[PDB]
């Protein structure tokens, strides 16, 4: 990703343009997002496969579990700078639900169709072109297996897009932690599953947070063009 980026930025610039991995440059359009597909394998066997729901397997499910469990803490890692979340605004289109489906998007975890079990996977889309693939991936994984690890179980897939007497517990329904401060928080608490293995010191975590923190501030202290729109003549 580190290259993928350098190259874009550069040819793009060499061509005559500026290239930007920001998640939501403009409003009412599409702000790039970095979907991440994944699966672990043992020998030349992806223990993500099997029977039981869309191909897949027990194993996978704990994964689907893991993410869903610390979704918030993760998106603190794989969803920074504020902008991140202007995309992670409740859509229906927008993947903010914490479920899995093979359709019924809105659903932040898509188990794409498959064919050859040879390649059965998990697409967790919410992550945005803005994270150190490093932390992000790590944290994705790190969780994924703490689920894989101590049981932890998805339950059922969506297949029933968002839209349900908004409340009607559709309200109840687990969300993609929309909103930095919030996300920041999660991570402050979730520590654990990260911290586990050594892959992640308290610091690391701390420092990290601590950083995103500042930006989050600069952003809210600075008054916004729109606020005038609506709030000015009062």
């Amino acid at each position: 990703i580190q290259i993928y980026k350098y190259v874009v930025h550069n040819v793009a610039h060499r061509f005559g343009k500026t290239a930007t991995f920001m998640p939501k440059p403009m409003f009412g359009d599409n702000g790039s997002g970095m979907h991440c597909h994944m699966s672990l394998a043992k020998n030349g066997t992806n223990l993500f496969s099997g029977d039981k729901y869309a191909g897949l397997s027990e194993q996978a499910l704990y994964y689907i579990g893991g993410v869903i469990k610390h979704a918030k803490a993760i998106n603190a890692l794989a969803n920074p700078t504020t902008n991140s979340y202007k995309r992670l605004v409740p859509g229906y289109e927008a993947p903010v639900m914490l479920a899995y489906s093979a359709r019924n998007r809105s659903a932040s975890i898509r188990i794409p169709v498959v064919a050859s079990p040879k390649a059965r996977r998990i697409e967790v889309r919410f992550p945005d072109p803005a994270a150190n693939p490093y932390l992000c991936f790590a944290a994705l994984l790190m969780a994924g297996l703490d689920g894989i690890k101590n049981k932890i179980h998805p339950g059922e897939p969506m297949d029933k897009n968002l839209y349900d007497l908004p409340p009607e517990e559709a309200k109840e329904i687990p969300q993609v932690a929309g909103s930095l401060e919030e996300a920041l928080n999660a991570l402050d608490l979730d520590r654990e599953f990260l911290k586990a293995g050594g892959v992640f010191t308290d610091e690391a975590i701390d420092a990290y947070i601590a950083l995103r923190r500042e930006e989050d501030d600069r952003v809210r202290m600075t008054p916004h063009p729109v606020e005038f729109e609506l709030y000015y003549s009062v």
């Binding site: 005038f228 729109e229 000015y232 003549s233």
Partner: protein
């Protein structure tokens, strides 16, 4: 009566008699008569002009029933005094009645008075509530090569970003939100207030005025009900 009008003529000095008089298959029209020329004959046999707006094959002159010599008043607006004194269509001619291809004011009455000959009742009241738009610049055109139109008036959201010099001053009503909000924000009253004064001056009865709901100068002035023929002409 004329005897009357007659005074009024001296009551005020006046010269000329005109503004608003005939009125098309579409709307409003006038011709100006030197103050003299008025005199019974005039009141009794009219004046006549011809065709243009609805009319076919030559010369169909039409009597101008200098009339509803009630519907007569000093127009503020024109320069030098003058009795705007409608006319009951062109009456016809020698028959003397429905102006060629119309006589909108006529039709009015046929209707009206016809009503009367049914017994369904005796008098029909109409109280229309006409709203209008008040803007600053209105440019448009169309032609082989292109077409277009532009509207502007300090107000109408759009204008905020707009630079002025005395400069912005930013209080204005944003899209469906011109809702009687008090002044700074209200392009202004004085225009309405004012319109009332004259409206009454002209002889209508005002019931209340205010801003309707539109970003850029939607204004409404209300007026007490009448009789079709009267109100219509009001």
């Amino acid at each position: 009566s004329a005897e009357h009008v007659l005074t009024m003529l001296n009551e005020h000095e006046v010269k000329f008699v005109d503004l608003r008089f005939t009125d098309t298959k579409g709307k409003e029209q006038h011709v100006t008569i030197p103050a003299h020329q008025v005199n019974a004959e005039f009141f009794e046999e009219g004046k006549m002009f011809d065709g243009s707006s609805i009319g076919g094959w030559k010369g169909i002159n039409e009597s101008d029933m200098v009339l509803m010599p009630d519907a007569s008043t000093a127009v503020i607006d024109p320069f030098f005094a003058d009795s705007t004194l409608i006319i009951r269509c062109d009456i016809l001619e020698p028959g003397t009645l429905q102006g060629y291809d119309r006589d909108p004011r006529s039709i009015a009455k046929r209707a009206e008075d016809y009503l009367r000959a049914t017994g369904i009742a005796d008098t029909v009241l109409f109280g229309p509530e006409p709203e209008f738009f008040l803007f600053d610049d209105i440019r448009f055109g169309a032609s082989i090569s292109g077409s277009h139109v532009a509207i502007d008036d300090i107000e109408g959201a759009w204008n905020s970003s707009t630079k002025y010099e005395g400069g912005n001053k930013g209080h204005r009503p944003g899209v469906k939100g011109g809702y009687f909000p008090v002044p700074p924000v209200d392009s202004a009253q004085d225009i309405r207030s004012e319109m009332c004064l004259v409206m009454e001056q002209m002889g209508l009865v005002v019931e209340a005025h205010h801003h309707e709901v539109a970003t850029a100068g939607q204004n409404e002035v209300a007026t007490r009900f009448n009789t079709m023929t009267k109100k219509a002409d009001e």
